[PDB]
Write a protein that binds this DNA or RNA. Structure first.
Ligand SMILES: [Mg+2]
Ligand SMILES: [Mg+2]
Ligand SMILES: [Mg+2]
Ligand SMILES: [Mg+2]
Ligand SMILES: [Mg+2]
Ligand SMILES: [Mg+2]
Ligand SMILES: [Mg+2]
Ligand SMILES: [Mg+2]
Ligand SMILES: [Mg+2]
Ligand SMILES: [Mg+2]
Ligand SMILES: [Mg+2]
Ligand SMILES: [Mg+2]
Ligand SMILES: [Mg+2]
Ligand SMILES: [Mg+2]
Ligand SMILES: [Mg+2]
Ligand SMILES: [Mg+2]
Ligand SMILES: [Mg+2]
Ligand SMILES: [Mg+2]
Ligand SMILES: [Mg+2]
Ligand SMILES: [Mg+2]
Ligand SMILES: [Mg+2]
Ligand SMILES: [Mg+2]
Ligand SMILES: [Mg+2]
Ligand SMILES: [Mg+2]
Ligand SMILES: [Mg+2]
Ligand SMILES: [Mg+2]
Ligand SMILES: [Mg+2]
Ligand SMILES: [Mg+2]
Ligand SMILES: [Mg+2]
Ligand SMILES: [Mg+2]
Ligand SMILES: [Mg+2]
Ligand SMILES: [Mg+2]
Ligand SMILES: [Mg+2]
Ligand SMILES: [Mg+2]
Ligand SMILES: [Mg+2]
Ligand SMILES: [Mg+2]
Ligand SMILES: [Mg+2]
Ligand SMILES: [Mg+2]
Ligand SMILES: [Mg+2]
Ligand SMILES: [Mg+2]
Ligand SMILES: [Mg+2]
Ligand SMILES: [Mg+2]
Ligand SMILES: [Mg+2]
Ligand SMILES: [Mg+2]
Ligand SMILES: [Mg+2]
Ligand SMILES: [Mg+2]
Ligand SMILES: [Mg+2]
Ligand SMILES: [Mg+2]
Ligand SMILES: [Mg+2]
Ligand SMILES: [Mg+2]
Ligand SMILES: [Mg+2]
Ligand SMILES: [Mg+2]
Ligand SMILES: [Mg+2]
Ligand SMILES: [Mg+2]
Ligand SMILES: [Mg+2]
Ligand SMILES: [Mg+2]
Ligand SMILES: [Mg+2]
Ligand SMILES: [Mg+2]
Ligand SMILES: [Mg+2]
Ligand SMILES: [Mg+2]
Ligand SMILES: [Mg+2]
Ligand SMILES: [Mg+2]
Ligand SMILES: [Mg+2]
Ligand SMILES: [Mg+2]
Ligand SMILES: [Mg+2]
Ligand SMILES: [Mg+2]
Lengths: 93, 54, 110
RNA sequence: AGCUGGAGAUACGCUUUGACUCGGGGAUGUCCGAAUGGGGAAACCCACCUCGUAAGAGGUAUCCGCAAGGAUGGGAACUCAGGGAACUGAAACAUCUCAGUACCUGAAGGAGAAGAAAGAGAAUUCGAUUCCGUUAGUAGCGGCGAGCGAACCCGGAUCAGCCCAAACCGAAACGCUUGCGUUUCGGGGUUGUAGGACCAUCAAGCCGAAGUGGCUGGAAAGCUACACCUCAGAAGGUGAGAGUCCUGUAGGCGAACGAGCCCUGAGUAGGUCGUUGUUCGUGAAACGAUGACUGAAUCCGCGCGGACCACCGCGCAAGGCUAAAUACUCCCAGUGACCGAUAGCGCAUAGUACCGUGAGGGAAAGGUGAAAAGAACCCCGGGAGGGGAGUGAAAGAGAACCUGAAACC
RNA sequence: CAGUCCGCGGAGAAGCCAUACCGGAAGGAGUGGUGGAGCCGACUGAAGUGCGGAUGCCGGCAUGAGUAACGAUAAAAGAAGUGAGAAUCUUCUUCGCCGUAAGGACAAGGGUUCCUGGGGAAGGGUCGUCCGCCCAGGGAAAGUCGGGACCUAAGGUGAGGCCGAACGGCGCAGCCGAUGGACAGCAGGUCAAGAUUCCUGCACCGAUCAUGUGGAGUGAUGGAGGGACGCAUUACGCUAUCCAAUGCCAAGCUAUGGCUAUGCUGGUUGGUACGCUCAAGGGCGAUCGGGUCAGAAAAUCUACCGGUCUGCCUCAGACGUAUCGGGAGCCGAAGUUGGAAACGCGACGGUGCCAAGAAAAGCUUCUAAACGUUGAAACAUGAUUGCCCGUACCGCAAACCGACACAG
């Protein structure tokens, strides 16, 4: 319904440093629109979204064994919440 | 009632995906096992749809 | 690319069956079926000693080991024995229910 | 009883309340594409209408028809049809041939076409259509040149002929000076030795006979001493050459669901003008075939018998349907005095790499070993490479891994 | 290659390699050496059956030869680092070279070449510890920028419609189609790598709703205006922006023979809000009424026709106050005076010319129909909403087109 939409939280030092600021970022399905992902976050974790941005990301084109191939195209999506932030306490721990 | 158990499966499935992006995923089998329970779910629903109504 | 089963992914032995070797230096040696790989025709019995060497690998340890291990073999062991060793196998005799096709040489089971 | 795709790699696990895998159905099936809500530079943009809680589901192109319900597109070769070459031969080249070939385009199926005599033909025989053999390079056509080339008889493969208009009854609706006639429905009626009216099994699979000791060897299937089975000695695997180790083979069984035998057709027959097909190139040129202009006859009637006439024979046109024998081979099995890595399909796989804006062109191919036992460990070197050691029958096999010829160093 | 015999073979086949032997030749044997799994001899049958040549084909290897060159004559030198190894990689200090470029920003077009950590086979015309190369992992954020959910030009489509052996050729409306019209924000900060996107400050836009004022008229796929456009010259004000100084501010020295600062070096404002502040330049006349024959009919809106009396609106930009930034520098100073000056802004200015210079919606104004006229139009505040695609990096070039890290 909408749990399927959220492909994975973004890892990496920048997403963590933002996660310290109360904004959260994850990869979502490339077909996903801004409204449905805002609603999917508001369903999946119960916080209100207050800001959004998204960015399609073609995969790095990589090669193994003289077989050259495109990798799956992601869609990163970053969102800021109102003062009831903190998401579920799944931070860096 | 079927949709409730479907979506309850979907939530933990996405939780497993979220850990799997992280270093924690000790039981990958639970991944695919969670999906067949979804499919069986949907399948059985169709198996009732034709039944009775004909 | 050549499948290696000219024997139709059939196997004349179960896992855990006692078995004797027909050919090679192991002819006339004895062993239970520890691992049965049908489509490849590979058979593991205890006693097919093989000295695999490795302390080059890091993963097990910065060194490692020479060590004694099994070397699986072709369905060139005798599949099943009896007080008479070797020998072929009749089937289709009935179990106490009859639902189990069984085995015999001159006569017997398993 | 294993399974967890190739894929060779770890971890996580599923399975004897039946996994996998194999046959049979179901159910999901994102977007493009005939694409079909509308747009568009395919796989992406933008909507509307009902369900209406929402997530989500369904509909929204055009053509034929009331309405079901059809159709659009694709398909290697095969079929039919609308158009229709030129090299070339003619030792030049116009008619001719090359050829209704190649090609384009349309329709369609597992075939298609054609087909149930207004015929062939010369015995007053034949009796649908298609295909093979033959007649036969006979007849014949041809700047009578290059060349082009039938049909009947006869022999086989396969053989089924079935249905409607129309004279006449019952209208019914409509058409007129009064028991009548334009197109609709049932009856009836389908022809030439004239007929007809109206009046006398294969699928997934299971079972399946029979050998042991010694020898060489690294290894046994070779050799050897004795045997056994055979409705089975086809074949492939196994450390090398196995009827008797495996898988099979001969034979036998085998399923809930599964595929498969007074009338008889007119703007037409006929004709003139342009043309054309069969051997038919204006030739004495019949006949079919149609563009233009015309335009008959009815059963004491009509078409043909190669200008034309009389006689003598064959046959009834202008409405339809019709299996099989016939063609091909994208695909499956079987087989081979077929290839075996420059051969063989281009490909031991790839329409990939690469070349091209494009249509399109387009490769090299391979081999440890029995089994990975795929070289622990030590030495020189960052390595790479190498020497020892081991594994192994062989390291005179070591992964630039069968042999390892010649140029050449 | 095939049929049939004879047989051979892990005590080792074919194949490969030497060889003084043998037949008249094509040829064939003996022995030895590799090789490691099939094969010779005889009789017969069938052939893709015998190579030095075809500027033959596929392939490998020679000669030229350690030869020509190493891709602009904008030179490079020392220290110090790293390291198995350095003329070439890193850093430091000098040097030289472009500077309407050889700097910067975009569009194409390419597609991860961007950043970090690693690597060293091959690509790099030498090297290589380095790279635009190999590996892995990150980076790419928009209600306001460009496009789309708007419009139209050429052009392409195209129900109907006109034609045409077929496929198809045209074709009114409509639709697609930017290269054009239309449209709401600027100043600053910063990951290793994004920025009118994110963060910070403070604006605007449209939409929905609420509170209230107002408390009633809204006012179309149709009419009308307007949007709506050429070139050359040219007057006035101004900004960007640059110059000067014994203006201010900041920091320290100096020495060579001198200057003791009036010397040296560097800085010397961006946005927003508010003004009885200064301001060129620019726009605009204004209603009453008549006629049907004009805009399909309507119309209080346009056009035609008659009567009727400098002024308004406007800020380009400057100046002040405040504020928010930035700001040389060792957290934060100063912000002056004079001048120069755009193709930019005021503007859709003036004047001259002839070759006589898009369309369309948005937009302003009218009624038709319809909906109401005690829950209008509009306005004010609060709240709520803000979709899709693009954005990394190269981008006069080592990352695009030239088969190349190419003098184009
Ligand atoms: Mg945002
Ligand atoms: Mg490689
Ligand atoms: Mg070593
Ligand atoms: Mg495997
Ligand atoms: Mg579409
Ligand atoms: Mg379409
Ligand atoms: Mg000629
Ligand atoms: Mg000619
Ligand atoms: Mg053809
Ligand atoms: Mg065709
Ligand atoms: Mg068709
Ligand atoms: Mg014997
Ligand atoms: Mg055999
Ligand atoms: Mg004629
Ligand atoms: Mg002639
Ligand atoms: Mg080949
Ligand atoms: Mg070769
Ligand atoms: Mg090919
Ligand atoms: Mg490629
Ligand atoms: Mg090596
Ligand atoms: Mg060697
Ligand atoms: Mg060798
Ligand atoms: Mg090797
Ligand atoms: Mg071999
Ligand atoms: Mg070799
Ligand atoms: Mg020998
Ligand atoms: Mg010789
Ligand atoms: Mg061998
Ligand atoms: Mg041979
Ligand atoms: Mg030849
Ligand atoms: Mg010669
Ligand atoms: Mg030659
Ligand atoms: Mg050559
Ligand atoms: Mg010289
Ligand atoms: Mg030289
Ligand atoms: Mg030169
Ligand atoms: Mg230097
Ligand atoms: Mg020094
Ligand atoms: Mg050092
Ligand atoms: Mg080196
Ligand atoms: Mg230093
Ligand atoms: Mg530049
Ligand atoms: Mg681009
Ligand atoms: Mg870089
Ligand atoms: Mg780096
Ligand atoms: Mg290198
Ligand atoms: Mg080099
Ligand atoms: Mg450098
Ligand atoms: Mg965006
Ligand atoms: Mg913003
Ligand atoms: Mg725009
Ligand atoms: Mg057109
Ligand atoms: Mg346009
Ligand atoms: Mg533009
Ligand atoms: Mg704007
Ligand atoms: Mg930082
Ligand atoms: Mg930047
Ligand atoms: Mg000019
Ligand atoms: Mg001075
Ligand atoms: Mg008004
Ligand atoms: Mg300019
Ligand atoms: Mg319009
Ligand atoms: Mg940029
Ligand atoms: Mg990009
Ligand atoms: Mg060139
Ligand atoms: Mg260049």
């Amino acid at each position: 319904s909408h749990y399927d939409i959220l492909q994975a939280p973004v890892i990496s030092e920048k997403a963590y440093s933002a996660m310290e600021r109360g904004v959260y970022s994850f990869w979502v399905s490339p077909k996903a629109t801004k409204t449905e992902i805002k609603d999917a976050i508001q369903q999946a974790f119960g916080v209100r979204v207050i800001g959004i941005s998204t960015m399609n990301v073609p995969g790095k084109r990589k090669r193994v064994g003289r077989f050259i191939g495109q990798r799956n195209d992601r869609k990163k999506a970053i969102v800021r919440l109102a003062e009831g932030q903190s998401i579920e306490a799944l931070a860096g721990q | 009632d079927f949709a409730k158990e479907i979506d309850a499966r979907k939530k933990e499935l996405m939780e497993l995906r979220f850990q799997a992006a992280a270093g924690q995923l000790a039981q990958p089998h639970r991944v695919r096992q969670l999906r067949r329970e979804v499919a069986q779910l949907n399948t059985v629903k169709a198996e009732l749809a034709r039944k009775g109504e004909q | 690319p050549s499948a290696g089963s000219h024997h139709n992914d059939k196997l004349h032995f179960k896992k855990g069956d006692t078995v004797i070797v027909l050919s090679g230096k192991h002819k006339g040696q004895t062993g239970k079926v520890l691992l049965a790989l049908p489509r490849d025709q590979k058979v593991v019995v205890e006693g097919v000693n093989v000295i695999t060497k490795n302390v080059k690998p890091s993963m097990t340890n910065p060194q490692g080991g020479q060590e004694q291990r099994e070397l699986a073999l072709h369905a060139s062991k005798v599949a099943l024995v009896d007080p008479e060793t070797g020998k072929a196998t009749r089937v289709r005799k009935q179990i106490v229910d009859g639902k189990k096709v069984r085995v015999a040489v001159a006569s017997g089971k398993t």
